[PDB]
Design a protein around this ligand. Structure first.
Ligand SMILES: O=c1ccn([C@@H]2O[C@H](COP(=O)(O)OP(=O)(O)NP(=O)(O)O)[C@@H](O)[C@H]2O)c(=O)[nH]1
Ligand SMILES: O=c1ccn([C@@H]2O[C@H](COP(=O)(O)OP(=O)(O)NP(=O)(O)O)[C@@H](O)[C@H]2O)c(=O)[nH]1
Ligand SMILES: [Cl-]
Ligand SMILES: [Cl-]
Ligand SMILES: [Cl-]
Ligand SMILES: [Mg+2]
Ligand SMILES: [Mg+2]
Lengths: 360, 359
């Protein structure tokens, strides 16, 4: 069956720093003119990130072909929204990618490209919050409790939580959201360069951040120690990006009742090396487990034991970095529960585009 | 017509983080078979960096074909040496690139691949110093003054200068070489992640680092202020990387009389926006000129005044960064002369390979 003959469908592509994800969503619309019954009918994920590849015709064609060709329905509107991988590039370079992408869509007749563009980290943060709250079913009715969302990406990280309008804070970090007939005010922030790829490029020669005897590029050996690695990463969070000074005073005044994390942290928390129950973690436990299971283990043995985890070599660093970000940066308690969403649910920010077509 | 019929020839590829450069050099050798009379007989530069492309046989074949095919001579030894762009990747990912590259070279019968590898930052630094001193004609005789070299690349930066052999400092950052009958002892260091591209990814939403009204990725506006941007970059140099604690004590004990800078800084210093005499800058003058002529300008207007410069938008950040690195990191006096080499001279570290493989 094609659901799109009886329900509205659109395609939304998350063109993220590490890869692109096509989603086709079916949905209906209610009397407030808001989508309801949003269902993902198709997903395809490819690597590497769109902004990583040579912006020539042959390369872009192979990539877009790989992403789209085998989709079960093509005669629908397409939203191509890139995030921090593209925001790392000069605007003149991004234009080369979008001109090639526009050309590609012009050479076929089925997909109807509505928009292709780089969205800001603040737009991405809004979509992050909408996507999680749609899955929680907390959008249709006014909530008594405060839901905070973090998106732990490769090139940027987002934090977003309810906060009344504040005249002392940049208009860019505040959004007023009207959805299902309710008004929601949110604080949004994205930290470009603090996603896990970009952050890691500052610590590749830090022995404390790699498993024992991991070969660092400078010829020294890993000698993992999560608390020590964490203190190194905290200097990038706070001395450089001032995460603490920006975020902590706001969260102190606008406490969050429930935290949800999406993005790459869900793959780490779900890996064989870790144990968490109920799809939730705490920072204390994530740092301890990373320390015990990776930082203080022998690299060759670990590499041979988990030959499928192409991210394994960074697990000591990532466990340390997530703690630095959430605890030292955002000021979240080490023993505070953080919910994460199984990666197999495909929950990125793209549901937020279905719900909310404007950009700020 | 045929420069390799009467001279030895070698190809050296700098597979750098932002692009690859094929050099073919002709040379003679002296009584010890050390190269002399090194002349660049071919240069070709392509983008992007090898370590950024998809590591499959079709992509790699196109990239190597673009880099190599039109070279005027092919039946010579080739070194393919990658630097910090490849160092950013774990060995498992690098292996995919070198296995494909090894296959591509086995498939043809003109080029004579000697080595394709990621060189260490310390070897890169050693080649940086040899290349510059070869061109200054300072290697033939024992210098009564210290020449220091900085290579300001895209993913790492190197610093290298004379330091007598000692038991105070780790053997890891000390190199000894014998060339043209003299013994030379150097301190070498490379800082991965502090090259310009990697550093810049931490400051793209910093208004102080861009011209007024430049559109930052987050939607805010540039509001350039080089001293402010410089203090931001300094926090990365010293609070995170501890450049100052690693380098300053050693330069205090081993002062450098003349500094030479290579890598991407030469393009910045050579641009139309800056006025330096005698192909030398000072850090204070670089910061002041970037502050006045880019940071404090209205971006749309400045971009229209200099419309053929795709790199201009980053000059407020880069002038701030270089001051942060050299002055706040290395401890160089802000008024000390730093020589730069005109970019048309194609002076990267590759002449160091020609020299060192014969030692
Ligand atoms: O199978 C996987 C796939 C990804 N990962 C991790 O997820 C990270 C990518 O997280 P993500 O997909 O949320 O980031 P992204 O590509 O959307 N990046 P951004 O949102 O554009 O910044 C990787 O860097 C790696 O750490 C795994 O551990 N295992
Ligand atoms: O024509 C050019 C080419 C490059 N550039 C600048 O030089 C920078 C690259 O400097 P480089 O060649 O020394 O770096 P690299 O590729 O060798 N990097 P690494 O040495 O591998 O770390 C670019 O990022 C760009 O800012 C120009 O300004 N003009
Ligand atoms: Cl290194
Ligand atoms: Cl590519
Ligand atoms: Cl942003
Ligand atoms: Mg993402
Ligand atoms: Mg270089």
């Amino acid at each position: 069956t094609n659901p799109c003959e009886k329900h509205s469908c659109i395609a939304v592509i998350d063109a993220g720093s590490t890869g692109s994800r096509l989603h086709i969503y079916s949905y209906d619309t209610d009397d407030t003119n808001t989508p309801i019954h949003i269902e993902e009918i198709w997903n395809k994920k490819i690597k590497p990130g769109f902004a990583s590849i040579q912006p020539n015709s042959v390369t872009i064609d192979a990539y877009l072909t790989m992403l789209l060709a085998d989709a079960p329905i093509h005669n629908i509107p397409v939203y191509f929204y890139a995030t921090a991988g593209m925001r790392l590039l000069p605007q003149s370079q991004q234009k080369k990618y979008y001109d090639e992408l526009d050309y590609w869509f012009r050479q076929q007749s089925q997909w109807q490209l509505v928009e292709a563009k780089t969205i800001t980290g603040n737009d991405e943060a809004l979509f992050d919050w909408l996507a999680v709250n749609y899955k929680l079913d907390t959008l249709k009715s006014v909530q008594n409790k405060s839901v905070g969302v973090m998106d732990m990406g490769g090139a940027s990280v987002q934090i977003v939580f309810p906060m009344p309008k504040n005249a002392e804070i940049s208009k860019h970090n505040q959004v007023e959201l009207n959805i299902y007939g309710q008004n929601i005010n949110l604080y949004v922030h994205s930290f470009l360069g603090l996603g896990q790829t970009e952050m890691s490029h500052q610590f590749l020669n830090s022995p404390s951040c790699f498993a024992n005897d991991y070969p660092l590029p400078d010829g020294e050996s890993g000698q993992g120690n999560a608390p020590s690695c964490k203190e190194e990463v905290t200097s990038l969070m706070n001395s450089v990006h001032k995460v603490n000074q920006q975020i902590q005073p706001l969260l102190a005044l606008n406490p969050v009742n429930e935290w949800y994390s999406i993005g790459g942290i869900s793959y780490l928390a779900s890996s064989q090396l870790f144990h968490f129950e109920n799809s939730e973690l705490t920072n204390q436990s994530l740092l301890q487990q990373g320390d015990n299971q990776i930082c203080h283990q022998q690299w060759d043995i670990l590499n041979g034991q988990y030959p499928d985890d192409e991210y394994l070599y960074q697990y000591c660093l990532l466990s340390s970095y997530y703690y630095a970000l959430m605890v030292d940066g955002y000021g979240i308690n080490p023993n505070q529960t953080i919910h994460y969403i199984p990666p197999e649910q495909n929950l990125d920010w793209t549901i937020g585009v279905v719900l909310h077509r404007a950009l700020e």
